[PDB]
C-alpha cells in the first residue's frame, strides 16, 4: 500500500559514506510511512544487526540477509522461504565438490548457513576457475547458483535463492509492483537484483563485475549513478521520480 519498495545492499552501497548515509536517512526519515525498506545484504542477520549499531542504520521493514538465503520479517525468520529454498537442495554434495578446488578456501563458519556455502578465491588463482566450478556444479543437477563478487567472494546458493528472487518474493508478499520498486547495489552479489524488473541503481563505487554486467544487460530501468554509496540512492530516487 506504500508508494515505494526500497531495497538496498549495505556495505559499499548504503553504508560507506557516513555523511551520505546520514542525509539519505534524514530525507527518508521525514516520509517514513511512504516506503517499505529492505536491506539485501550478503551478511548474516546477526552480522547485519551489528553493522546497524556501528553506523546507525535506520530500522528496515525486512532483512534479506545472506544474499537472500534468509528473510527476516519483524516477527522473525520466514519459515516458508526456508522450506522453499530447501527443496532439491543438497548442500553436502555441493560442498564436497567446491571443497575440492585448491584455489578455494572456505570462509568463516559463521558466513555459512543451511542454504549458503561460501568461499574465498585465491588472489593468485585464475578467475576462470569459477567458470569450471559453476559448470561442474550445474552438472550435478542440483539447482545451484554461483555468485562471485569483488573478484574474491564465492557463494553457492539454491537457484531459488538470490537477492533478486528474495526481492521478487517480497514484492509478492507486499503486493508491490516492479515499477514501485528500487534496487540498489555495488557488486556481483547484487546482480540478481538488476535481473529483476524493478527500477535499479548502480553506485559509482561499483565493482568491475557489476559494471561489466551493466554494459551487457543494462536496460532502461537501470541507472548508473554519478554518486557513490548512499548518495547514489538519493540520486536514484530523484531520477525515477519516487516519493513524488
Ligand atoms: Mg554488494
UniProtKB/TrEMBL annotation:
This is sucrose-phosphate phosphatase. The lineage of its organism: Bacteria, Bacillati, Cyanobacteriota, Cyanophyceae, Synechococcales. One of its GO terms (molecular function) is magnesium ion binding. Keywords: Hydrolase, Metal-binding. GO terms for biological process: sucrose biosynthetic process. InterPro entries: HAD-like_sf (IPR036412), HAD-SF_hydro_IIB (IPR006379), HAD_sf (IPR023214), SPP-like_dom (IPR006380), Sucrose_Phosphatase (IPR051518), Sucrose_phosphatase_pln/cyn (IPR012847). Mg(2+) 2 binds at residues 9, 186-187, 189-190. The keyword Glycoprotein does not apply. Its cofactor is Mg(2+). Residues 3-241 form the Sucrose phosphatase-like domain. PANTHER family: SUCROSE-PHOSPHATASE 2-RELATED. Its EC number is 3.1.3.24. It comes from Synechocystis sp. (strain ATCC 27184 / PCC 6803 / Kazusa). Mg(2+) 1 binds at residues 9, 11, 186. Belongs to the sucrose phosphatase family. It catalyses: sucrose 6(F)-phosphate + H2O = sucrose + phosphate. Transmembrane segments: none annotated. Pathway: Glycan biosynthesis; sucrose biosynthesis; sucrose from D-fructose 6-phosphate and UDP-alpha-D-glucose: step 2/2. The keyword Disulfide bond does not apply.
Amino acid at each position: 500500500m506504500r508508494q515505494l519498495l526500497l531495497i538496498s545492499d549495505l556495505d559499499n552501497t548504503w553504508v560507506g559514506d557516513q555523511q551520505a548515509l546520514e542525509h539519505l536517512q534524514e530525507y527518508l526519515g521525514d516520509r517514513r510511512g511512504n516506503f517499505y525498506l529492505a536491506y539485501a545484504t550478503g551478511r548474516s542477520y546477526h552480522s547485519a544487526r551489528e553493522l546497524q549499531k556501528q553506523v546507525g542504520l535506520m530500522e528496515p521493514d525486512y532483512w534479506l540477509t545472506a544474499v537472500g538465503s534468509e528473510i527476516y520479517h519483524p516477527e522473525g525468520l520466514d519459515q516458508h522461504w526456508a522450506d522453499y529454498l530447501s527443496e532439491h537442495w543438497q548442500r553436502d554434495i555441493l560442498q564436497a565438490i567446491a571443497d575440492g578446488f585448491e584455489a578455494l578456501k572456505p570462509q568463516s563458519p559463521l558466513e555459512q548457513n543451511p542454504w549458503k556455502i561460501s568461499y574465498h578465491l585465491d588472489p593468485q588463482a585464475c578467475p576462470t576457475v569459477i567458470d569450471q566450478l559453476t559448470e561442474m556444479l550445474k552438472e550435478t543437477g542440483i539447482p545451484v547458483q554461483v555468485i562471485f563478487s569483488s573478484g574474491k567472494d564465492v557463494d553457492l546458493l539454491p537457484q531459488r535463492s538470490n537477492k533478486g528472487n528474495a526481492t521478487q518474493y517480497l514484492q509478492q508478499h507486499l503486493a508491490m509492483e516492479p515499477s514501485q520498486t528500487l534496487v540498489c547495489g555495488d557488486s556481483g552479489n547484487d546482480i540478481g537484483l538488476f535481473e529483476t524488473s524493478a527500477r535499479g541503481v548502480i553506485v559509482r563505487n561499483a565493482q568491475p563485475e557489476l559494471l561489466h554486467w551493466y554494459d551487457q544487460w543494462g536496460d532502461s530501468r537501470h541507472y548508473r549513478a554519478q554518486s557513490s554509496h548512499a548518495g547514489a540512492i538519493l540520486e536514484a530516487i530523484a531520477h525515477f521520480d519516487f516519493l513524488s
